[model samples]
Target: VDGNYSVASNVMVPMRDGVRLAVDLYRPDADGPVPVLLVRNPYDKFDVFAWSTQSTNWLEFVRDGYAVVIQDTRGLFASEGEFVPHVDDEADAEDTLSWILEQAWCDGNVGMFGVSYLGVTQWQAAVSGVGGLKAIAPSMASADLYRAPWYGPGGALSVEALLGWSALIGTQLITSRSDARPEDAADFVQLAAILNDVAGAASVTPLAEQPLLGRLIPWVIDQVVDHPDNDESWQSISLFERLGGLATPALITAGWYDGFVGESLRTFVAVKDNADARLVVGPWSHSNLTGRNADRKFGIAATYPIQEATTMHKAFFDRHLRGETDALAGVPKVRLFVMGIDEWRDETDWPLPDTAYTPFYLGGSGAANTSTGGGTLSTSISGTESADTYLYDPADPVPSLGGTLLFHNGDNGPADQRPIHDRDDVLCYSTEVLTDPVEVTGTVSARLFVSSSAVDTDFTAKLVDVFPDGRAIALCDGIVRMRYRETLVNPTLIEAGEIYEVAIDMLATSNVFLPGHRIMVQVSSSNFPKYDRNSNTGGVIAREQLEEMCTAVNRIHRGPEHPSHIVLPIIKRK
Candidate 1:
């Protein structure tokens, strides 16, 4: 009733490999050849636009005089090839684009839009050096598989998110198997149970041996076990190195709380030199695009209607694909939703041109453990101070409460950290409540002089905005494995008890610490299930069915000589 559009569902589009993918096409009722908007995803095409909580109405595109195409990647849902996620996206997307250009309804121009893996397909298409793809709007995704969310910051497997995602894809794989049996149907149920209890599934010993995932989605096992080190295998699939090849005008939508924010920013920076790139970051999480999370509401401006992602997508495509001069006339190259203020500001560039990389030094009495402890964060360096020590036991690892996660359901994004602040294993350092607002609007990282009792261990740093009500909401967080100190491709086991300087990348965030809020950083050895527990054995952790995991006494040095501090990208107000 809203508009007139016709749908041609389940049209098979052929790839070069002779396999056909399932595609659905929506066209305007009065259309002569119209510019096309494409979305190729591993998820089924039938209900993608209609049922997605983060909705992008294909009918809206058709009603506005553009053709819309949604397709399932090869071997998933209604597609006709073996589904190994991301392996064939480049070729398939390129083939699909060629087919779209040959169609009578297409006006030789194409653009793409989607979120997560759907977003990932556009990047794959861009790298194909394919013609006809004039623009793309990739939201909440990154081409870097070795980076956060896919793989944890410090080379640890993002156990909960990855395993949860694996179970989801595994469910599709098992149920749609050509050799399907009643037992396979039962396996799908088991996978559903695992999805429900990802924490329990992540707890399984020797992550490599997870029964259903290993059996059904062996590619995941290949990722977790075979390539813990970010080597050639990961490089082959990653788009970071190949980002230079993309000439398509891109609209990258990211979230401050999204796991892929760092990589999103990285990709934008890499390609902006050659591409007409635009970036928009909100107070959203991986799936929660409404700008509301478990504990807080950013503002009315942060809501989907105000943010208008689909409209934004339409405008960007209209500008590049249809050559509409005023489509995105006033939109700036960058738009950021600053959290505390709950306002959107247009910026000219990222890492803002005038960011003050301020270091907040860590200082305290040796007992800087728990929220009540006297750990302090200040701009001034401290005189010789005693190092803080905390024992990290795999059995009693710190539970993940909030921050970036894809499959924790609604529990992802910013939440009160005060619950975990009570744990002695977590060292909390906070600045006194601010008199003036402090704006931290770029990548956050920590440099620590540390020593551990084990050959290999992990250190996690989390940025928190502590409110007067004692609510410590996390902003961004990251982890680093001790063995991956210098290089991601190689692991050099550290000498036990020998001090070394390591940097933990806490990813990126755009948050304003209001006058009443305190800036806080929590350093811990593990944020369990959010990341796999380090076995501390220095052995092949992925295969370790550790009957008994070792506990390590991890020490953080804080003094003038061994300065342990977090670097905050501060933007001084005009």
Candidate 2:
């Protein structure tokens, strides 16, 4: 096809291993050569046609006089090689860039863009410092795949997101194979039967025992089991750890409540100093993060600022790709949307220097188990307080409610968490409705002196926003497996009744607690399905939960000596 733009499909682009990746290359029919905009998608490029505006946007990009290449990452559609997310993206991306530069319609300069897994590919590829790759626009991806929500913050496994992703990828691969190789029709049906049971695929015993999932899913139990937290073996596969240097200019975008917000933050900060990178943290979550949650409406300004910045996303690409600097010059290096007020603020850096690392001590009446309990959060460590006790039964773990989630499980994003805190298992502490706006703009953490009756267990904590009308919406939350408290590589069974100080990093965020809106902290033993259930047996975990489950009676002690508190990076405006 030819005119203002032309298209070529099913082009087998070769990689280093003699394998090839299938790509749909779209070239503008303009005079000479032009910079390329490559978007590598695990989702079939043709599949994007389902979304009208998006499908039409392809022509718009072609009209922009850029060589647009949309592809199927190796092992997905027509691409060759074994499929594994993150494992071969760097090398594959490098080879693909080299191929594009050598093409008749190509120029040496190129830029990459995408969201979620697609976004993750851009970061991983950029970190490789591959030539011909000048810039990237990675949206809502955690470069630190080694950390929380991917793996656990303190080794508690990530269940929901991984399970949801596995089902998608498994189906994508199997369906394509079944179509291409009709002989496997019988096996495909069997695979479908196994894939249909996503819960069982990810449930009890060793995850590898699951028929299709353990075999084809990108991440399985072995990842958590084989490597210690942040070990070389794990970091080698991570997008950031191996990043010797980031020479490419990048536009990093993320949602405040997105699953990878903290990971994204760490990535931006790490690369910002070494490269020309900018960050925009709106109120988005894992899937598009901020703009369109049924439970939230971050306002018009909360919409994707990249498109809003240049009217069209391609314009942002045009800035670096075609040298349209003056237009994007006004964009801030850092743009953060402060919730509660529902406003956006532009800044030069993150975790502002004026950040006051304030501590809100947790000292509650013995009945700090449920939302209505006498749990209190205070600025001053006023006096001695009693211990809060609750029973943690693995058979009935706490369910994941609002906040970052996948598979549309429960209401996600900034939704009311009163239902979650309603359970007596959750310990909620609120500060007397805020007298002024307390802006929390960075990392939040909680240090608690805890103990368990079982050999080992899990401690979960969540930062909440309680409105004047008593609507409690969860913000950032995290979990710490008791066995990995000291270090993930080493596991020490809990000494039945000995006290242990555990710190739970509840990730990062930028939000404001307006007057009359209280800051709350909820403590529990589980955030189930989100994080797999801990049997309390300190037992082996995998396909079948063969470990004998036990009921753990946990205790949270808070006193002048053991001041359990939540640390907030509260920013005080001048």
Candidate 3:
């Protein structure tokens, strides 16, 4: 084996649609046909193959006798075509794979690898039936853009991260085009400068300056302006239907703190059910997979310790593409990182075989009220004596503390619910101190039997791991705008003050509520900023005026007749 490799950079391939995409190829310096590792990314393609102090180590694979090919997708840097998100990959990926297989350096076998956009492109291409893509290692990726963390689920607008990502990537596109033409670059730079200078104070700007603001921000502002319901625009891109057909061998990884945790699990379940898929989840944020910080939280037992994620990725590609018979063969279908205890566990399924579907009954005065008063979780739903009631003020909405948000990385940090848990606007309910340890894994759901004062409102359910000392750590949470309770695409508004039963999907989790700790469920009307505040005035999003904000009383009833409860996948001790 040699450490030296030869690079053929910036090779252009014209797709059937007349789009010219740029590719960088890394092959052994001593030429012999080698398996290919294809990475399609919207991020800079030039950097993918380059060896720099700051760049990812791609040469490591070239030294391992594997040829690495990296390409820029359509409408991104160095690639020609309009770069609409998730649109061109299905067709272009097949074309790209066909071209790569035809190249002289290719050994007719290909494996795909990359994180984020690159990861997602692998699944998209696999679904489209790329000829040479034998397997893929997609980390922190989602198959469907609509069901992705950015939108859907409570119809909360993914602020910070999603918008920031669009702006950052969009900036690169604008800059890349500027580089190709100095005049255009100069104009773009000047326009960007103006927009950046007045970013906060001003409302509207040019597309090049604030790409997301120019496009989605306004559309989100206009379309969801007053209406707090899931509409066709949000549902059109949902890819749940395509999951049953994914046949590629996939290595899916996600972090508990990452925005795409639910999507990652869905990908794993879909691929495992339909094809061959392996899951490795850790307690990490978006970019913490390849660093020491995640290693501390993920513990030493991880298949590929957090610091060695790249090695794990390479191993997956090696086994699948190079036919290396090694440890990966013995790896279980599921590998999850258990937080609180901070350890890794291998399991046959997500919920584990010994899981007990426990129902925590919500008992209180049938009033949808503030956090100060009357809601409790009981073993049975019928033992309730009162109703809980609280007034939801649309004007002074509850600000988002943490859970899932698009922009701010702060949510992934240690869960400190003190500020929010104590707020009058948020309702907190907890079971008595557990007599024994209860392990909760898999999907969590809350069945609410109640009525809203408005035609549309939002209900948020959060699953928290309460420590012995009373620190409430959020395991998983979910939100459902009242109107879309039945279905996401076609929302049916509720009659004000009429009782209706709806199930809210609280994201999945793998955790153990240690003995003496309590299993707490927090119900609230708003988790603002993380989710745009539901105006409560029956108006659309973005378009609601200040005067339209209203205060409405919410009621949560309990008894045999109106038994509201949360379902937990409780794993029993072996």
TM per candidate comes to 0.96, 0.90, 0.86
lDDT, residue 309, candidate 2: 38
Residue-level lDDT tens digits of model 3 in 1-574: 4777878888998899777999988888655788888888887888644212212355677787888888988877877877776657878888899998998888888988777777778777787666578798777778756556555565655544444555555456666763465455564564455334322212221111334344523433343332334455444444556768767788888766667777877888877866667788876556344313411233455323533555665677777787786847666778887765567778887656777788898765544344445566777766644556567776666665446544544324335566675566577777778887778888789988767788878778888877776667677777887867777666667888898787887777777787888888888777655555666766554455546666777766667888788999877766
**Which candidate leads in lDDT?**
1
lDDT of 1: 0.84
Predicted candidate 2 versus true structure: per-residue lDDT over 1-574, tens digit per residue: 3447778899999998999999988888866778998888887876765322211254666776778888889888878887877788888988888898898777778988777777788887786666778778777776767674467566876766666666667667877772565545664565555445434444555543544556666355456434435566666767775543666777777777777777777777877777767787778666553366555567888765543533434656667677777746676778888887789898888767678899899876668889889899998883875789999887778877766665435336776777766687899888998788988988888999999999898998889888877778778888888988988666778898999999997888788898989899999998877777777877664433534577899988887988999999988885
Best candidate per TM-score, number?
A: 1
Better of 1 and 3 by TM-score: 1
Quote the positional error of residue 325 for candidate 1 in Å.
Answer: 2.5
In candidate 1, which residue ranges exceed 4 Å CA deviation? 1-3, 49-52, 174-180
Show where candidate 2 strays beyond 4 Å.
1-3, 49-60, 178-208, 215-233, 288-295, 309-319, 323-327, 408-411, 543-547
Q: Report every candidate's CA lDDT.
A: 0.84, 0.75, 0.67
TM-score of 1: 0.96
Candidate 2 has a TM-score of 0.90
